[PDB]
Amino acid sequence: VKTGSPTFVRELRSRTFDSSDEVILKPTGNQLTVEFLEENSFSVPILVLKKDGLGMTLPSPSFTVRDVEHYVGSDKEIDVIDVTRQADCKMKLGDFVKYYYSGKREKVLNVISLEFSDTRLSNLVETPKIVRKLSWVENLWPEECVFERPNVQKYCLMSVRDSYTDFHIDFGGTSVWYHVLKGEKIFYLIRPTNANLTLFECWSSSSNQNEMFFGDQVDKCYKCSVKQGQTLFIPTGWIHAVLTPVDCLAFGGNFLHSLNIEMQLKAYEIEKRLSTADLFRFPNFETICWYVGKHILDIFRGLRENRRHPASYLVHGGKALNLAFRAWTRKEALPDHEDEIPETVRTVQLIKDLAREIRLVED
Amino acid sequence: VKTGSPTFVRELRSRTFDSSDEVILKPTGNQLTVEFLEENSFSVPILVLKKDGLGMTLPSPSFTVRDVEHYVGSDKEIDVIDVTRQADCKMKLGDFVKYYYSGKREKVLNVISLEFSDTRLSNLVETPKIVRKLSWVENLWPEECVFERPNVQKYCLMSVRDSYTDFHIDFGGTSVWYHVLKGEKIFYLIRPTNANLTLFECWSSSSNQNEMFFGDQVDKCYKCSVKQGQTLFIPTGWIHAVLTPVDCLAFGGNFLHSLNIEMQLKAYEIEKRLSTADLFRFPNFETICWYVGKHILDIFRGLRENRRHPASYLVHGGKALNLAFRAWTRKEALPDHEDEIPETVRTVQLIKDLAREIRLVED
Ligand SMILES: OC[C@H]1O[C@@H](O)[C@H](O)[C@@H](O)[C@@H]1O
Ligand SMILES: OC[C@H]1O[C@@H](O)[C@H](O)[C@@H](O)[C@@H]1O
Ligand SMILES: OC[C@H]1O[C@@H](O)[C@H](O)[C@@H](O)[C@@H]1O
Ligand SMILES: OC[C@H]1O[C@@H](O)[C@H](O)[C@@H](O)[C@@H]1O
Ligand code: NI
Ligand code: NI
């Protein structure tokens, strides 16, 4: 049985898996704050039932694929996946709209990466406040920087019934939020334990990858239905597949943050190796790491100047970052990383100082 | 208003707090496994509704205080707390039994630390299998060792209506399980974030500690009702108070484990400083740490010999342990720690080797 085919989907549909209720947190919008995520950590998926308190702005649930076309443009080239889990290709949006309303489902076409930040649609959607507060690119990417800035904050997803996206780790080790405006999406979520990552890498490389349901190889594969008006936040590194059971229109975006830097670096390294994408959807990952390194040093200096202590998660994140910094700048690795280092950063000193501040904060 | 008084309790009772449902996990007995705790971590309280699958052995819910007396002995001296949150004192068990059945509640007396391992009662109670699997003392304390072995595996608790135990961290940085055989207990649980620990230390030292409800000073104080037949597991460091709303008989025990060693060391250090106990209920904490250090080194060596990787939590735990090892053996600190070091342990080499194995496992 080939992954993505109609028989594969018919079978997937009848499966139950482990209940998402065993792992997800379900705060209200008002409860999902920075403090909440610092205290709770952001290590399991978070499903918010109603959008109230999330600080989003969205069109009404009456919004359509035709509307998307109007705000984005008929002529926009968009990446489409032919859900016979086969190929990628470009398509004019108007041609997709034609396919969509045609109702002809001989080919199952899925749109999941229409980034609309530079279109009129951008004015109609504001992302969750928590994301805007956490996001590295949003808060810590310097205006003066001359590197290409990642542009992955606003995606529109348009998925016909029976769309399937196979298990993957989100690009660049990012976390992601998804809001289903209409229809439903089913996420199959797997925790990125070292053990699961090993199985994932093995499966990603196996010759019969398209015939093996990854969720079967792990201890726990959690099924999470995200229905109309609901918002899902997936933490760094979580391995997941998505079945679209009914026609779905959704919005989402990808971000990096400081809550679990070790997991972020790890997810980044693994996905970089395993990805079959032709482009880095998150360019200059390392660059932003360097800037964050300096900012975290500043935080530690400040806390010490004021006789206060950092939260544990920051200490650990700063340490894992510093390990990465040393690895990227070793004599023999430097050639493959130098290009990503901002010309304003003195790496040897940043590393030395970070190490010092971190030593003055352990026990 | 003084903490522990009848008016304090009457007021506590009407309070709602944050719902425990926001943080606790509620697996079944069969689900609560070592793998479960390694994957999920053990960082939030765990409430298991039915004992099935937990591997415990318990008398029936018809067991009584009179029965306890029969299996433990009328003449056993037991630590009693006079729940006018005032004093500790010793009592013969038979005198407590007299007080209990007397029904006279002019004094509110609470028994929470009757350790019965060396009595006939021990034969009637077997602790949860997960605890026996995790426990450091149970699995890693060497037979040949000549240090006094902590004896904290089996407690019987007998608590009249309106008993109150004020906010505290469990002794020796231990984790704890409690099974309510009859009645109910209400736990007020606070996460041991660095920020909360700072407030806790401040409150523990404040001159009007007995007039300040600690739960009010923190972002989140979670109320968790543990009813008949239910079992609660509290992770390392969690700050908690207990109100007994109705006559309660319960069993419990304290253990150390390897899932979050940093938090364990931290909780140990803080509780050691703040405790007003005359005795260490967990003697030789450092001793067992040293033995665990060597065992973890052995694990790392094994994994490397077999070209396999350790789980992330073990790497972090091994690191925090090694930091402690260095701190305990610095020239100027050594005098206050040398007594706890097993004469079979070569600390300088253990530390060097641990550090080496840990470096060979980061990235
Ligand atoms: O996708 C199916 C839905 O949208 C269009 O593609 C079809 O024309 C409609 O008949 C249907 O309601
Ligand atoms: O991150 C997930 C990656 O692993 C596998 O799913 C595939 O080989 C890639 O197409 C994918 O990008
Ligand atoms: O604690 C109260 C309960 O046990 C005894 O102390 C009393 O004699 C009983 O009347 C009551 O059922
Ligand atoms: O661990 C908690 C400790 O802090 C405060 O509750 C009190 O000062 C001690 O009696 C207690 O042992
Ligand atoms: Ni995704
Ligand atoms: Ni306790």
Curated annotation (Swiss-Prot), chains A, B:
- Signal sequence interval, chain numbering: none
Q: Does the keyword Chaperone apply?
A: no
Q: Which UniProt keywords apply?
A: Activator, Cell cycle, Chromatin regulator, Dioxygenase, Disease variant, Intellectual disability, Iron, Metal-binding, Nucleus, Oxidoreductase, Phosphoprotein, Transcription, Transcription regulation, Zinc, Zinc-finger
User: Major location, coarse class?
Assistant: nucleus
**Effect after changing residue 168 to A:** Abolishes histone methyltransferase activity
* Residue ranges of every copy of the JmjC domain listed in the record: 116-272
- Positions annotated to bind Fe cation: 168, 170, 240
Q: Which GO terms describe its molecular function?
A: chromatin binding; histone demethylase activity; histone H3K27me2/H3K27me3 demethylase activity; histone H3K36 demethylase activity; histone H3K36me/H3K36me2 demethylase activity; histone H3K4me3 reader activity; histone H3K9 demethylase activity; histone H3K9me/H3K9me2 demethylase activity
Modified positions (Phosphoserine) are 5
The answer to whether keyword Zinc applies is yes
Q: Where in the cell is it found?
A: Nucleus; Nucleus, Nucleolus
User: What superkingdom heads the lineage?
Assistant: Eukaryota
Q: What is known of its domains?
A: The PHD-type zinc finger mediates the binding to H3K4me3. Binding to H3K4me3 promotes its access to H3K9me2.
Q: Could you say which protein family the record assigns here?
A: Belongs to the JHDM1 histone demethylase family. JHDM1D subfamily.
Oligomeric state and interaction partners are given as:
Interacts with POLR1B, UBTF, SETD1A, HCFC1, E2F1 and ZNF711. Interacts with ZNF263; recruited to the SIX3 promoter along with other proteins involved in chromatin modification and transcriptional corepression where it contributes to transcriptional repression.
* Role description: Histone lysine demethylase with selectivity for the di- and monomethyl states that plays a key role cell cycle progression, rDNA transcription and brain development. Demethylates mono- and dimethylated histone H3 'Lys-9' residue (H3K9Me1 and H3K9Me2), dimethylated H3 'Lys-27' (H3K27Me2) and monomethylated histone H4 'Lys-20' residue (H4K20Me1). Acts as a transcription activator as H3K9Me1, H3K9Me2, H3K27Me2 and H4K20Me1 are epigenetic repressive marks. Involved in cell cycle progression by being required to control G1-S transition.
Mind telling me what this protein is named?
Histone lysine demethylase PHF8
Q: Where does this protein come from, organism-wise?
A: Homo sapiens (Human)
Which portion of the complete protein is shown here? Answer: 116 to 478 of 1060
